[PDB]
From a paper:
Hydroxysteroid 17-beta-dehydrogenase 13 ([name]) is a hepatic lipid droplet-associated enzyme that is upregulated in patients with non-alcoholic fatty liver disease. Recently, there have been several reports that predicted loss of function variants in [name] protect against the progression of steatosis to non-alcoholic steatohepatitis with fibrosis and hepatocellular carcinoma. Here we report crystal structures of full length [name] in complex with its NAD+ cofactor, and with lipid/detergent molecules and small molecule inhibitors from two distinct series in the ligand binding pocket. The overall structure of each [name] subunit could be divided into two parts: (i) the catalytic core domain (residues 29–259) that contained the cofactor binding site and the catalytic center and (ii) the membrane anchoring domain that consisted of the N-terminal helix (N2-P28) which was highly hydrophobic and a C-terminal proximal helix-turn-helix motif (P260-N286) which formed an amphipathic patch on the protein surface.
Based on findings from dog [name] crystals, we changed four surface residues distant from the active site of human [name] to those of dog protein at the dog [name] crystal interface (Q60K, I62R, R71H, and E161K, human mutant) to improve the resolution of the human [name] crystals and obtained useful crystals of the human mutant [name] in complex with NAD+ and compound 2 (compound 2-human). The crystal of the compound 2-human [name] contained four [name] dimer complexes in the asymmetric unit, with 2 occupying all the protein subunits. In some subunits, long rod-shaped electron densities were observed together with those of 2 at the binding sites. We built detergent C12E8 molecules into these densities, but these densities could be from the alkyl chain of the solubilized endogenous phospholipids as well. Like 1, 2 binding also displaced the C-terminal peptides in [name]. In detergent co-existing binding sites, these peptides, as extensions of the P274-N286 helices, shifted positions relative to those of the apo dog [name] to interact with bound C12E8 molecules. Like 1, the negatively charged carboxylate of 2 formed hydrogen bonds with S172 and Y185 and contacted the positively charged nicotinamide ring of NAD+ at closest distances of 3.1 Å to the C4N and C5N atoms. The terminal tosyl group extended toward the lipid membrane, interacting with the helix-turn-helix motif. While the terminal fluorophenyl of 1 pointed toward an opening that faces solvent, this opening was sealed by the extended P274-A291 helix in the 2 complex with detergent. Observations of lipid/detergent molecules in human [name]/2 complex interacting with the N-terminal helices and the helix-turn-helix motifs directly demonstrated that these structural elements are indeed responsible for membrane anchoring.
Residue numbers in the entry:
A (entry chain B): 1 to 231, 235 to 286
B (entry chain A): 1 to 22, 28 to 229, 233 to 291
The structure:
Amino acid sequence: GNIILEILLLLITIIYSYLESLVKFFIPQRRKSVAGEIVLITGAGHGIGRQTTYEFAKRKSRLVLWDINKHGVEETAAECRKLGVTAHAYVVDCSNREEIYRSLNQVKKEVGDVTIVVNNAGTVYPADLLSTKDEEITKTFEVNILGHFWITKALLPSMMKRNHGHIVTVASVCGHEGIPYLIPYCSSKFAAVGFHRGLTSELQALGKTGIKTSCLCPVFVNTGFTKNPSTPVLETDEVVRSLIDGILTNKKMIFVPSYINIFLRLQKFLPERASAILNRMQN
Amino acid sequence: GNIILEILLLLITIIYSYLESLPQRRKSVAGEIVLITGAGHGIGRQTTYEFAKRKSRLVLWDINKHGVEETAAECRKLGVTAHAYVVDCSNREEIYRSLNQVKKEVGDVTIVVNNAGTVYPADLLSTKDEEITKTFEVNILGHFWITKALLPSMMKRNHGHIVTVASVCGHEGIPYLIPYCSSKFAAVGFHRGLTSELQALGKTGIKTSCLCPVFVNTGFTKNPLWPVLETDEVVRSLIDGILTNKKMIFVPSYINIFLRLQKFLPERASAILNRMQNIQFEA
Ligand SMILES: NC(=O)c1ccc[n+]([C@@H]2O[C@H](COP(=O)([O-])OP(=O)(O)OC[C@H]3O[C@@H](n4cnc5c(N)ncnc54)[C@H](O)[C@@H]3O)[C@@H](O)[C@H]2O)c1
Ligand SMILES: NC(=O)c1ccc[n+]([C@@H]2O[C@H](COP(=O)([O-])OP(=O)(O)OC[C@H]3O[C@@H](n4cnc5c(N)ncnc54)[C@H](O)[C@@H]3O)[C@@H](O)[C@H]2O)c1
Ligand SMILES: CCCCCCCCCCCCOCCOCCOCCOCCOCCOCCOCCOCCO
Ligand SMILES: Cc1ccc(S(=O)(=O)c2cc(C)cc(S(=O)(=O)Nc3ccc(C(=O)O)cc3)c2C)cc1
Ligand SMILES: Cc1ccc(S(=O)(=O)c2cc(C)cc(S(=O)(=O)Nc3ccc(C(=O)O)cc3)c2C)cc1
């Protein structure tokens, strides 16, 4: 039953996870400057996107804000002006491929070539698979993953030429494990994780060392995106603090909280029937 | 998170003794209505013959009219007259129209093997946006429409089997296949979510299986040297998994250990691997 092999792999995962916390704590990493960088933040009209925007504004980055909610993106750009940075706000629908391209040409003309992309815009329609609407399933994929492909394909050429860039994919713990009443959302978030993992490998194979990639995978955050969790509740400030620390230290996989990867790692040692029961309990 | 880390460990070692250290029963698929997508070649074609040998009622789907007809002809030689159809699994409306025809002519599908898949190998900047959309429409979106249509009958009877044919690319991203890996990650996520949702809905008699093989010699991608897998081995692992209700079927089975040892891949080995990846891309 590969029991000896599996006990040794369990101990290695545990020892490695322990050493990973030690290094995180005792060996502090150098943290880069994002000042002057052209930062595009999608879904910047609320929550994680709005707070992330303010962290870049504080660090004197050049900002390009995108969101479908015209009032929200304008409200974020107004607070950026108070923080000392005049942001370039646009109301762009990240589900639309043509709209993304048209708006990125406007960004090239008015602002310049984007250097850091935070693909934060996302959508969810909680329901059991048989109660879902097919239009909503398509929309979940168009925003949560297909939009990432079109924004990256458009901005990547300049980053490749310069061997300098940063692609931030905002995925979720739902990109690592599936949960009830969120099947299309988990599937689209798994695709976002896969996009980041593949992009990271391809840039490495192409020798584009200077183009960094980061993937944000937080647990339930109190932003109104969803009203209640599936399996503590995070505050937006903690997530943004972890995201900025990860971007500046070129962290590839940013779990929020950092230790949730221990749970995810240990679950790989369980049958799927057991892990599914596990993520459905409330003791 | 101390307490949950411990409940995970006690849970791991509990299932190590439950069925990991304990006369395996294999079910009968005779008389079952089996739908196999992408049945005109490779894995789908061989899987079809295994169900025909086990006296299952067969419904075959493929875009390639000649290939699906060739498979249905060999089924007749095996003793089963199959119902072959030319259906494009990327088209939501075509899937629904064809499934109404299957309901009228054959009946309610009991086992679904979502095997049809597509790939357009290229580095992200050389990909065609139509091909990126097509990769998602076939590899993941088609799984959603086929399942939503066939699931109600399986729910009513508490009996069924949803087989998701994903790939090792659903567990790790590889260069020059970013949209393909992203769509395969979504397929894995769909299976994981479906498994949890069925458990939450109390419909566990609808079993789920996810096939994740390494490179198979079927012509899906061109051959590069590196060990190659044969279609017969994959189909043998798939059938054994379906009959024994295996949820995660890696081919070969031990590639789950390889995925777990990725953090330990020596820098020298990564340099050779991402050197053969481009040596074969150039072909
Ligand atoms: N909230 C959580 O619990 C949670 C957890 C993990 C991951 N995430 C992810 O974090 C990201 C941000 O979510 P949030 O928690 O800040 O939610 P939020 O509701 O506060 O903000 C999301 C923003 O994205 C915008 N947006 C949605 N669709 C868009 C589109 N088509 N084009 C442009 N903008 C669009 C919305 O209008 C909104 O301003 C999402 O990708 C979400 O999946 C959220
Ligand atoms: N070949 C491998 O190396 C490999 C490895 C892991 C996983 N897989 C997966 O296994 C599955 C089967 O691939 P294969 O290796 O048997 O390849 P294959 O080329 O031999 O056969 C795939 C079949 O799917 C059909 N198909 C493609 N698009 C379709 C559509 N829109 N509608 C209906 N049918 C369609 C094709 O006509 C073909 O007959 C795919 O999902 C693939 O991603 C393949
Ligand atoms: C602190 C650490 C302790 C140090 C001591 C180390 C001792 C030895 C350790 C051994 C570790 C071995 O682990 C290997 C894990 O590998 C898993 C990596 O998975 C990543 C996926 O990448 C695989 C890519 O495949 C490479 C081959 O590419 C060619 C494939 O050709 C076939 C397909 O061709 C068509 C594709 O287009
Ligand atoms: C006991 C235990 C079980 C699971 C985990 S986990 O970190 O693997 C985990 C996995 C998912 C899968 C969801 C959640 S959740 O409860 O936070 N639920 C949500 C997570 C994300 C989202 C979203 O992105 O909208 C909406 C709910 C969490 C904590 C940690 C500890
Ligand atoms: C040294 C080493 C490295 C990786 C592995 S692995 O088993 O984790 C692995 C991971 C992926 C990620 C791909 C592959 S691959 O080389 O088989 N590549 C392909 C896999 C699937 C497909 C396809 O689905 O078409 C097309 C190529 C493999 C062996 C085992 C040993």
